[PDB]
Amino acid sequence: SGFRKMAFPSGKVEGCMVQVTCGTTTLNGLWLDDVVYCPRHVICTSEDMLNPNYEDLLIRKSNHNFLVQAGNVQLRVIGHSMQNCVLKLKVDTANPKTPKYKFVRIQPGQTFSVLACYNGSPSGVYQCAMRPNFTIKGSFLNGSCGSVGFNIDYDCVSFCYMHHMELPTGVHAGTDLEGNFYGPFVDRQTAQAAGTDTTITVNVLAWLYAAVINGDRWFLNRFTTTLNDFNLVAMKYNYEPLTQDHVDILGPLSAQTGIAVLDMCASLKELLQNGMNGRTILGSALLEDEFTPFDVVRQC
Amino acid sequence: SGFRKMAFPSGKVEGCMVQVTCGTTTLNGLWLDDVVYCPRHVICTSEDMLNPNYEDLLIRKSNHNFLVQAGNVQLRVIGHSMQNCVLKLKVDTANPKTPKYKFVRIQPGQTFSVLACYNGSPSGVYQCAMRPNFTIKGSFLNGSCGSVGFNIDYDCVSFCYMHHMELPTGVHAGTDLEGNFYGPFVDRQTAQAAGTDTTITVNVLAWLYAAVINGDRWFLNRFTTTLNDFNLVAMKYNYEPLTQDHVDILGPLSAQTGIAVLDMCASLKELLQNGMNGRTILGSALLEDEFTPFDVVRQCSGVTF
């Protein structure tokens, strides 16, 4: 019993964190095999940030401009290339702690663990979701760029995010491990703003199922609803519309608790109209949307 | 920016998790040097648990009854002894991944990271607080016993908790790494209940400072209060009393934000009597009490491990 926001054990990712320094900029790098991945903005100065030509700046760099440090050992950069917004530094030593890994691009609503690092040293691990507006609500300070988001499948680390920047509202933007940004963001100091964020409806529903599995039932009702009637109410509360894919994904939890998806949807509709009336669900006074259906099944 | 419930990196602890099997029971063990620590109830069956004489049960066990597995390698148990509610299995091989470590007993209000394990395999990490009633509001399924709680201080792991059981309300009880239970709990299948829990006041204050550091400041007011007036109001809302030690510990945060502790106490006093008025603090509608003052400083300053 119990329900917690739970991150994956970060050990397999800690053994990959290194420090990458280019000139006056120091950030984190992900050392996998003989390659160190890091945000390409490490090659930027003060002048080339509003409108940098990364292809031009990288052509001017030599292997000896990059200083890579893994623990108390300096790694030798023998090559450099750019893949989208990620810089790839070939090194003359393969990481002996390289776990089994994949690079995966996730969709909004998906969750992952973040290993926040500073100077190649892991400082904390927390759980995040890719917001529908493609930002993440992380906890990051200056020097955290290059910190990675990941999930663990048995023994395999799926790297899904690399931290690049903080937007003016305090939310964070980054890329997958192939350097493609999540969202309409660019690694330029140009005026950027996250779109209005919305609630991940399928995740709220999965969390309501987790609460039922844990013995919370006060929010349940005898109503059901149509998917269309639910979406029309949900959207007035800035909730994402629920698709037939989401209803199918909630199937196992529905079978486990004996509460049909559209029956749980009607309970969600009531919570939105009423509020919690001084009550909590799983120790929370707000509806939690950072637990996917797969997270709930895994944890329960 | 941002404020998250954040656990310590669990890597140094993952390299110590092993599987301990005794008869039909399989749980987790903590392998440090040539010793594997695990809950002493691993030697019990369902019948033994009702009224267990652990000293008598352990005397009947031989080293070969314990099956220890580190990854897919079996460790050979060359000795066994009991220290309070923890069983210590001497093995022939010292853990090469043994980090710098200490065994520490924590106080209520203190926080720590839990590496939840099943069959000696780490499955998740989360941050939690030792409640004033000495339970932890964890997330544990069957097989999680032997999962450990820890903090990291520089490059030293301080092991502070080992999971033993789940109480009828769904909250959890365990011991320090010397086998002494936190709280008035016993490792026997008997009627047990956690005492009425209270809020960790010093932690709520630290979290209010974290919110101010993050720009969330609607709850601040012009008022201050005496420590005595604050504690009289706090006592009525099931909040732990705030001591002069707590006021001193909140000092650096008071200096950083420009909000004196008793000034923040007057904000908390109003929040308790009037509520949040439909507003949130750090995206939460409840006052969060599982971040210590040190956790807030560490997170809002980027200390690494």
Ligand SMILES: CN[C@H](C(=O)Nc1cncc2ccccc12)c1ccc(Cl)c(Cl)c1
């Ligand atoms: C110097 N790196 C920053 C950046 O946002 N860096 C940070 C990352 N995370 C949190 C931070 C909190 C406070 C201050 C900086 C933080 C930056 C600025 C603009 C662009 Cl376009 C890019 Cl790619 C990067």
Ligand SMILES: CN[C@H](C(=O)Nc1cncc2ccccc12)c1ccc(Cl)c(Cl)c1
């Ligand atoms: C076999 N260990 C169980 C126990 O409570 N085991 C669990 C520990 N954590 C979470 C659980 C969730 C669901 C089911 C079991 C869980 C047990 C029973 C009574 C006593 Cl007195 C003791 Cl010491 C141990």
